[PDB]
């Protein structure tokens, strides 16, 4: 699994960052670290894919980056409706296809 902070919070309108820390064999070696937004009781929605790419239909307040073995999701302009469990998912090769992190409660 990937390590994520148990929770991240801030006031409406502020920018916060949810980090995801992995190892050299997964986040480091591959530029495939997606992010999902899971509202409680609902299926996860895709927010970020590859490293910096964003699916159509997702607003410009959700962005991200990768440095070393650490990836992060930046949520600017926090809204009341952004409360969700956020997850990172990294591609980790042929034997271990995907690794998910622990959920972060916004």
């Amino acid at each position: 699994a990937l390590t994520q902070p148990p929770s991240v919070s801030g006031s409406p309108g502020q920018s916060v960052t949810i980090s995801c820390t992995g190892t050299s064999s997964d986040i480091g070696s591959y530029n495939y670290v997606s992010w999902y937004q899971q509202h409680p009781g609902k299926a996860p929605k895709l927010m970020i894919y590859d490293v910096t790419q964003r699916p159509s239909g997702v607003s410009d307040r959700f962005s991200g980056s990768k440095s070393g073995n650490t990836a992060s999701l930046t949520i600017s302009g926090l809204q009341a409706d952004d409360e969700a469990d956020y997850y990172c998912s990294a591609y980790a090769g042929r034997q271990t296809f995907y690794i998910f992190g622990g959920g972060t409660r916004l």
Binding site: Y32, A43, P44, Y49, D50, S89, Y91
Partner: peptide, 12 residues
């Protein structure tokens, strides 16, 4: 092109 992400989800 490459995916390596889950594009669509069901209800479960």
């Amino acid at each position: 092109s490459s995916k390596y992400y889950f594009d669509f989800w069901g209800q479960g």
